[PDB]
Amino acid sequence: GPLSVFGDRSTGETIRSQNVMAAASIANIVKSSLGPVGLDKMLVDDIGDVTITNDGATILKLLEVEHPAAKVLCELADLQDKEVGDGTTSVVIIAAELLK
Amino acid sequence: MMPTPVILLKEGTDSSQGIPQLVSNISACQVIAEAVRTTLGPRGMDKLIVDGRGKATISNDGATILKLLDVVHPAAKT
Amino acid sequence: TSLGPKGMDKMIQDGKGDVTITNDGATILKQMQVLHPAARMLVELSKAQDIEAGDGTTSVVIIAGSLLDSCTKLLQKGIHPTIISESFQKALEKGIEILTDMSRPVELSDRETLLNSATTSLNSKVVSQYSSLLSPMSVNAVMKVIDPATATSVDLRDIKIVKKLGGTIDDCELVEGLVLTQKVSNSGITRVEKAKIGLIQFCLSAPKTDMDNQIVVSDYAQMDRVLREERAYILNLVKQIKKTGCNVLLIQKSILRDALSDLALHFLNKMKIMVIKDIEREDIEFICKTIGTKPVAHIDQFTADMLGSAELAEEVNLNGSGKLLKITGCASPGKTVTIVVRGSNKLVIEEAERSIHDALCVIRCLVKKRALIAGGGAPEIELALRLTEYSRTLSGMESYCVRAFADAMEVIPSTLAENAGLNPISTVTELRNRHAQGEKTAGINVRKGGISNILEELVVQPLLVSVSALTLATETVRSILKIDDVVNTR
Amino acid sequence: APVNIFKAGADEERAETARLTSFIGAIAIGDLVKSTLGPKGMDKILLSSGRDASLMVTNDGATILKNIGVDNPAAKVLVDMSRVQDDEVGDGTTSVTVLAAELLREAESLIAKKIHPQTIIAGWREATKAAREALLSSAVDHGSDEVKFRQDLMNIAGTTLSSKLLTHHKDHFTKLAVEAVLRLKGSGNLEAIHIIKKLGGSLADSYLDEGFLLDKKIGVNQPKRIENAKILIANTGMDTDKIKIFGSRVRVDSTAKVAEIEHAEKEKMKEKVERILKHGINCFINRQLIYNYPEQLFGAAGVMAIEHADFAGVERLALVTGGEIASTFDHPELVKLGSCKLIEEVMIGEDKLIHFSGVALGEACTIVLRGATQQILDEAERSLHDALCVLAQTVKDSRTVYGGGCSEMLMAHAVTQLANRTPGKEAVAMESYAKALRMLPTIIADNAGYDSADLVAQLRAAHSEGNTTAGLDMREGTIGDMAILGITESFQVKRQVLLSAAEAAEVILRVDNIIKAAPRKRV
Amino acid sequence: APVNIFKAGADEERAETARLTSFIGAIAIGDLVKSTLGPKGMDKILLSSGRDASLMVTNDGATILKNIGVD
Amino acid sequence: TLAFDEYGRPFLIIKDQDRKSRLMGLEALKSHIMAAKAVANTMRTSLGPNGLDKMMVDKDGDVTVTNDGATILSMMDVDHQIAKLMVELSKSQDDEIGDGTTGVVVLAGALLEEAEQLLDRGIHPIRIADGYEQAARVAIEHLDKISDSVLVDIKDTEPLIQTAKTTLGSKVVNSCHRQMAEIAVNAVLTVADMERRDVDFELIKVEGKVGGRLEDTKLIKGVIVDKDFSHPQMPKKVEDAKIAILTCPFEPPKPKTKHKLDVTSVEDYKALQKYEKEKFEEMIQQIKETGANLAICQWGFDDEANHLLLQNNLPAVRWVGGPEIELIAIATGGRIVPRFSELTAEKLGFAGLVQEISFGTTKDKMLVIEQCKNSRAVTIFIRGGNKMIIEEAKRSLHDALCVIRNLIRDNRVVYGGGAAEISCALAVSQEADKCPTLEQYAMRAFADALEVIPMALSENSGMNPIQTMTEVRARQVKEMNPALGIDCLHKGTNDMKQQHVIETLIGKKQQISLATQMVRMILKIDDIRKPGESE
Amino acid sequence: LGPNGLDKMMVDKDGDVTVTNDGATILSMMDVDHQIAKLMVELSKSQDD
């Protein structure tokens, strides 16, 4: 009857809905730090090292993501730093909205 | 780590506020609606729901579907 | 749901954390890791298509699964498996002759057939929207290195892929020269014009023999007779190189001995000789064909006869995942070409590599057999109608088993209609009516949203794909119907 | 025994369950492979517990039984029997397995009649001798008149292959088996016919290579194709020769001497290659690996060199090229070279192989085996191995017998006619031997789905009144003449099935007591 | 039946062991009382493990079988 | 996602949502059809004259071997909401008609199996369900075209006995193929009400006693009860019975309310002793004054009564149950008398020989009544060599009694042996192409499903279904459609008119209608919400 | 004992199986746990030697 694959398989509207959530969970991080009226974040790791930043690149490099749809936005931010060098906040905000 | 007074105000109470709470409340309403989306019209389908007694009910009337879903979310109950 | 230009891709994540997105049915099945002993036979089926055709990889599985499914209504009527197997064999032998009816002979000089076939294979790929570039690249990558009209085979292992992160698909290259991932030291040159290139396997370091070597010091100045001699030895090696007239060195990686000493590079850097180091023992075969150099094992043989040519040898300063070396232009270029793959994300680049190979395999088939047929489900409808007429002339159990083989043929035009958003009940019926009338070139037009002429849409598939799809699928399922006893060993 | 036990961790069974469990466990082996007997049988898939399970699809009883893992100490007796049959003749492994099982089944029924186990054994010994004479007196000889001898080899090849995957491909693989052996005209090494397995194409697309294929493509800086090449094979050292002095060091006052010795090191390697090249050769194959330095010297000389084609590859090349191993080169005038027409590379299954075509004294060949799946390739390879093993012996012992159950009924007839001349104490046991012999044509018909109730009665009735060539017609489901149909089996294969089942079966009948030592490494 | 079983705690056997185990059990009864057939048969000792072990010697086949507890 | 929102907070809609399961798509539909295949594969093995038996082992260890689908399907442990409905299908057929306990499952399964291809063709799940209605009407309308009977339920009972033989032929009692067929006919026709065509199920009692053989089963024109004469020396034979049915104990009458008699003087103590003695004498003489010579009492007796019963030559039995005294009074034409003082000759029952039967070494003492006067009740006494054949014989005669009742309700019959099913399949196929608007595939699927019965019958009969079906279907078209069926031994030709294979019209009409409705209510579902583990 | 005697099957600790006629092997492969029974085994061994 079912596939003999020993893992977990989801099809149809399940993954089409999850990728929207995972992408939003990343855009929700940097949306609050856009423009001169934005505010900074403090990132604290498990052992007590404290980093202060508001840039989309450092934040997404330090914060771990698990969903394969979220890694796409993290890679997008990394590419912006390589190609341009700046502006790495709108590429995550705009890209997430295109999916929505 | 913030609400750490030497004496607590109430006991252990959960509290949410603002935009994520409204979005959550609307989202709960969108999800519960899924139970009847396929029941509308002359070509709608029926649903089979099994209760704790082991007995199934087969129906398509919203007044019988929504009462068996065991809804707990404060907003979805609306 | 991954069949036809309107199909979709799948994501699979393994237990190590390697996430891939792919369309090719063969690359899906290899990652699913299906355990069932009977379904694993479909993985081997798809493997054979990857070798024999290279682009027959999805339709072979839906056929094989349908042929087995068509046998259920036969087994449930008491028809002995040996009757079903012989009946499908006869249906195959007639099916292949039917396919030749649609064939059209071509020649390798026809640029339009080559561009159209390469384009067709890209319609189902994630790069289908870059076909205006990747298509003439796919044809040019092959037709210049196989010496057309001198051979009946193509060895695609001489078309190399270089993957870099950055840019987009429009930035891909089809450079005819040599692309290396090795580094240059020193970096004070970075570009040489009108170069003579040499390949050296000799180690430019202190002398050493196969035997254990010991230097014995027994006096004061004896230590200086060692240091002064080793310096002279290494310099003498450099002088042999410089007097030859070379400009750029290709140094093969050594394990037991240091290939490039600090003193050797010191003199070479002052003499303006550019050194490319850490070239693997497996890289020299491509270098020898692409540039035309020969290795030298003994420095005393390093003369002009082993040197090649290059019009421009430069380091390419990329803004992405590092940088690369590019050597462009030479006398008597060899039968090699490099494709440079670009992209914004690693997932796209990896799929682009497979799509490039899928297109390259198209010409490989067309060289082996210079004949094509219309696609779009046209040969499947033709088989279904002609095989039905065949079965109408049979008697006995074959009259029920042969039609079952024919019934399986409709699974593809039915699936193609569904994936395109069309109603298969009317689409397949209209297809069978049009072909019965005589419209042998009618099929599913996913661009118009209906049934139209396949040839006008330039959707054309090599004959070998439909011939191999039935040959490999049929033999596989006629074996599966023969294996009927599961024993679990202790 | 169970009362007053004086054993540490061991147990024993006597006279009650010792024989019961021995007969059940051993007879079960026959039922396992019973379904594989005859031309219409079904095949098995054998599965492992995991850790690269390495799924195997096979028909032959020997490959089935040797991978089961039988734990029963009595059932193991028949497993070893099937191993020997595979090693000796390579065919009939199912027939001997099921025959021994049927003999044992009858023995249990005879014990139920209160017949002493030594009387049963004695009866089978007399019945076995009767069956041996039936085979000796019915053998068919083939001597000269090669137009009839070749037909016999085609019949033997067809019979063996009809029971394996290569069913409806007989018109291709029958010739691959018979002709490959005839071309050897020598010792039945069974390694001179190499099989290369490739995916792509159908089984019918396999072919015989008239020459010899090598792996390890033609060098780096060496010619790719030479016409009318002289071939030299070698088993010598290319580099790091370290000539025969153990514990020798270079101890000098300065590095200048090291550089001078390094030149001498290469000069001797240069001389070594020149000593080989003086032979006047075009192709050089050396078992040991070729290093960067001699590769340039051979390239500069216009001579190709192959490194490490295989461990035994050089020995196989010697037989098909007509040369000698030549591990040392110090008298070029005493070294024989081979010769061929083409040394070009060919593309087979998207893999470039070195093709030695037109090779003189080519007493070897290669079969190129094509298939859709790996399971098809592995079972098809085994089918070729089985047919070649029988043919390599048929060309040495031309005696054959009539198949299709003919030989089995002839043996059962001789046992029956003589059993009726013996007193009942033993005749009941001799009759049971004949009954087991008749189970073989019954199983064959039963696997195909034929009405064995009539085929057995008709075949016995035929052989009761002459008709010593009568047998099963597995195409129509009737009784036919084996000589006209051309259904024959090797004498040696049939002899060993008879003798092995009888000898092995006695092992079980003789045992009334099993003593099982305490197990180790079980917690 | 063995594929896609929809039973809670139940099972079933068909065409393979259903008839085999039926024959095994029927013969097992026969072999028990076989020794009591005829004028020279042997007698049995029937006992339980305890709780009034109710030791009985019997010959008659019906008396034997009605005290075994066939499962 | 559930239990995780885009803001990192938990997302909880329903209680214990992580332990639920929902899968809609086409997978709910394929799962329902697939589960039905497991059910159909069971019942197909017991269809036809060669149908094989099932052994059912109950939760308490009890074992019974049966053929009756009602006894097979009712003892299942299947925990699947749709497979349970397949059992209800067999129940509805059993309650209304009582024959097709196997047929409706095989037919309904075929409709679900053939529907599988229709979903894969892209046909809307509901359009499939509606398409079956258009084809079903065709089969039903033609089913009523070919029918005839000569049964009058007076004396020409030949086709009625033949109907009982057709039904019983599938059971394990063919050693009594004729004997039980005649018993069943006589049992019903002697109690049936010809005026309304009603048969009261309570007027035929079925009893049994382990021992003997099936050939010893008899129809008794009377009643059988557990006889236990209160006095052990009472004569056990009454030649001409005048039966008093009484529902009062043979003891001095007592009030129902709280009494508490006050006794003070010795004259009160002794006087009561006399009065009570007289009550024992009067209650017995009040029976003799009516001419009665056999009393049957719901209650027990006092020791004083047993002596008086002896001296007055008045046999009696004790503790006869509620339904037993009800049936005795009706069978004997009498009435139940409340009290002793209300006894009168007009309420006495009339019967002939009264005897008790002893069976082997046991003390069962079962009643037999030889003669009766216009009785409207009968008793069947089933014998057998083991408990299993007797219990199966009860069901075997039950089916035979039911099909007789069905002919009384409606005397229209059809030809069996698959002739009706093949003819219907051909009729639907002819109209399936009039007109192929949308439903061409669905109507043909219905026609193919109808053939599941002669095909399964052919398999169980040992024939190839292709070789058998192709010949019969051709012969029914080349010539004016005869009642041509199939059989295992062929009996010469397969002419159902000569084999006398008779089935009821209203039986098959219900099998088609009930199977179709059951399929519809389980196709039109695309969501199953069954709970998983408790915690 | 004697030409009409029956043989024994000895199953060794490693799974090897041998059907034996001679007493020395029959007894040497038994896991005897009794001080006097072992001496009876030694008796058979001495006769074999």
Residue numbers in the entry:
A (entry chain a): 3 to 102
B (entry chain H): 1 to 78
C (entry chain M): 50 to 539
D (entry chain L): 7 to 529
E (entry chain B): 7 to 77
F (entry chain E): 4 to 538
G (entry chain e): 50 to 98
Give the text the authors published on this PDB structure:
It has a double-ring structure, and each ring consists of eight paralogous subunits (denoted as CCT1–CCT8) arranged in a specific order. Each TRiC subunit consists of three domains: the substrate-recognition apical domain (A domain) and the ATP-binding equatorial domain (E domain) linked by the intermediate domain (I domain).
In the current work, our control experiment of cryo-EM analysis on human TRiC incubated for 30 s with 1 mM ATP, a physiological concentration of ATP in the cell, further revealed the ability of human TRiC to close both rings, with a non-negligible population (27.2%) of such closed TRiC being detected. This both-rings-closed TRiC map resembled that of the closed TRiC-tubulin-S3.
